[PDB]
C-alpha cells in the first residue's frame, strides 16, 4: 500500500528509524527514572538499618 | 544473618533494553543516512488502472501473438 | 523481624532482576515467592490471636467477682 500511492522507500525507512529512536528514547527515559527512584529511595532510608544497607551494598 | 531466600542475581549486563540496540545491531549508518521514489522513478521516465494494477497485485508465444493480431496504421 | 528484611530485599531484588534478565522465567517465581511470603506473614501473625482470645476470657470471670463484692457490701450497708 505504500507503493500504491507512489513514493520512494527512503522516506518510509526514515520514518521507521525515527519512530524506533523515539521508542528507544522513551524506554531510556523510563529506565533512568526508575533507576533514580531506586537510588533516592535507597539513600533516603539509609538510617533504618545500617547492617541491611551494608549487606545490600556488599552483595549489590 | 543471611536473609531468607536470597539468591544470585543474573549476569551483570546481559542483553537488555537499556543498551543502544541499533548501534549494537550495526544499523547506525543507515539511520544516520535516513534521519519520492516515484519522483526518482519520474526522473527516469515522464510522470508517477494504476487502480487495476493494484487490484491485480492485491490478490498476490511472443512471436505467435504478434502474427495473430494486426493493427491498422491509419 | 527477619522476614521483614527478606521481603523488602526481594522487592528490591525483584526491581532490578527485571533489567538483569527480562526474558527469564524466574520473575514469576519471585512474584509467587512474594505471594508465598505474603501467605507466611498472615499465617504467622494469626498465631497470636488464639492467645489473645484466651486473655479476653479471664476478665469476664474476673470482673463479676469485682461486681459481686460491691453488690453484697452495698446490700449490707442498706
UniProtKB/Swiss-Prot annotation, chain A:
Compartments, as annotated in UniProt: Nucleus
Domain of life: Eukaryota
Assembly and oligomerization: Component of the Mediator complex, which is composed of MED1, MED4, MED6, MED7, MED8, MED9, MED10, MED11, MED12, MED13, MED13L, MED14, MED15, MED16, MED17, MED18, MED19, MED20, MED21, MED22, MED23, MED24, MED25, MED26, MED27, MED29, MED30, MED31, CCNC, CDK8 and CDC2L6/CDK11. The MED12, MED13, CCNC and CDK8 subunits form a distinct module termed the CDK8 module. Mediator containing the CDK8 module is less active than Mediator lacking this module in supporting transcriptional activation.
Entry function: Component of the Mediator complex, a coactivator involved in the regulated transcription of nearly all RNA polymerase II-dependent genes. Mediator functions as a bridge to convey information from gene-specific regulatory proteins to the basal RNA polymerase II transcription machinery. Mediator is recruited to promoters by direct interactions with regulatory proteins and serves as a scaffold for the assembly of a functional preinitiation complex with RNA polymerase II and the general transcription factors.
Family as reported in the entry's similarity comment: Belongs to the Mediator complex subunit 10 family.
Record's protein name: Mediator of RNA polymerase II transcription subunit 10
Originating organism: Homo sapiens
Gene this chain is encoded by: MED10
UniProtKB/Swiss-Prot annotation, chain B:
Subcellular location: Nucleus
Record keywords: Activator, Nucleus, Phosphoprotein, Transcription, Transcription regulation
A single GO cellular-component term on record: nucleoplasm
UniProt-listed GO biological process terms: positive regulation of transcription by RNA polymerase II; positive regulation of transcription elongation by RNA polymerase II; positive regulation of transcription initiation by RNA polymerase II; RNA polymerase II preinitiation complex assembly
Assigned protein family: Belongs to the Mediator complex subunit 19 family.
Function: Component of the Mediator complex, a coactivator involved in the regulated transcription of nearly all RNA polymerase II-dependent genes. Mediator functions as a bridge to convey information from gene-specific regulatory proteins to the basal RNA polymerase II transcription machinery. Mediator is recruited to promoters by direct interactions with regulatory proteins and serves as a scaffold for the assembly of a functional preinitiation complex with RNA polymerase II and the general transcription factors.
Protein name from the UniProt record: Mediator of RNA polymerase II transcription subunit 19
Curated annotation (Swiss-Prot), chain C:
Locations listed in the record: Nucleus
Superkingdom per UniProt: Eukaryota
Post-translational modification: Constitutively sumoylated.
Function recorded in the entry: Component of the Mediator complex, a coactivator involved in the regulated transcription of nearly all RNA polymerase II-dependent genes. Mediator functions as a bridge to convey information from gene-specific regulatory proteins to the basal RNA polymerase II transcription machinery. Mediator is recruited to promoters by direct interactions with regulatory proteins and serves as a scaffold for the assembly of a functional preinitiation complex with RNA polymerase II and the general transcription factors.
Family named by the database record: Belongs to the Mediator complex subunit 7 family.
Subunit structure: Component of the Mediator complex, which is composed of MED1, MED4, MED6, MED7, MED8, MED9, MED10, MED11, MED12, MED13, MED13L, MED14, MED15, MED16, MED17, MED18, MED19, MED20, MED21, MED22, MED23, MED24, MED25, MED26, MED27, MED29, MED30, MED31, CCNC, CDK8 and CDC2L6/CDK11. The MED12, MED13, CCNC and CDK8 subunits form a distinct module termed the CDK8 module. Mediator containing the CDK8 module is less active than Mediator lacking this module in supporting transcriptional activation.
Protein name: Mediator of RNA polymerase II transcription subunit 7
Source organism per UniProt: Homo sapiens (Human)
